[PDB]
Design a protein around this ligand. Structure first.
Ligand SMILES: O=C1CC[C@@H](c2ccccc2)N1Nc1ncnc2[nH]cc(Cl)c12
Length: 167
């Protein structure tokens, strides 16, 4: 039993809710919150901008030191950093951005990073301003992640479109 509440169960291990991941994180303080990152960990907008703002820019400061030491992530890759005031850890995961030209086959690889963590609070990867179809993304998530994932979908209209159509 964990402290998440109000989620619709999609499968044995995937749950979904119409919520802001930032507010969910502040309420639950999960072990792992997933950021929808880019390879540079430049947290400008979307989920990343919102999470970083909630940390008072501490996420960005930590991220810049990470990149200065290690260089950029791979598309489809991830790194574990601090969760600051929002969670124990933040798993920064890079889904492909098709508005940048990135290969959507890499979305499965991105979701595979979730399997290294027993429980996660996450957004849909590559959706929103990353330009991919959120219905597709949800399907890849369900077909790839085997650990317990709690998905927060902020957009109400999209959320309604997703659950009622989830096969
Ligand atoms: O509604 C959706 C579906 C796709 C995803 C998205 C991911 C990357 C960039 C833009 C959007 N998204 N946004 C969020 N999901 C949960 N919490 C959130 N807090 C603030 C925002 Cl934006 C947000």
């Amino acid at each position: 039993v964990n402290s998440f509440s109000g989620y619709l169960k999609l499968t044995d291990n995937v749950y979904i809710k119409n919520a802001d991941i930032v507010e969910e994180a502040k309420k639950v303080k999960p072990t792992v919150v997933v950021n929808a990152a880019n390879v540079y960990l430049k947290h400008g907008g979307g989920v990343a901008g919102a999470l970083n703002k909630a940390t008072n820019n501490a996420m960005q400061v930590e991220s810049d030191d990470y990149i200065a030491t290690n260089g950029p992530l791979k598309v489809g890759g991830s790194c574990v950093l601090s969760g600051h005031n929002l969670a124990k850890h933040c798993l920064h995961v890079v889904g492909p951005n098709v508005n940048k030209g990135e290969d959507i086959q890499l979305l499965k690889s991105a979701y595979e990073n979730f399997n290294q963590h027993e429980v996660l609070l996450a957004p849909l990867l590559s959706a929103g301003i990353f330009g991919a179809d959120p219905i597709h993304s949800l399907r890849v998530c369900v077909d790839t992640v085997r650990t317990n994932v709690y998905l927060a979908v902020f957009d109400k209209n999209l959320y309604d479109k997703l659950v009622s159509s989830f096969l």
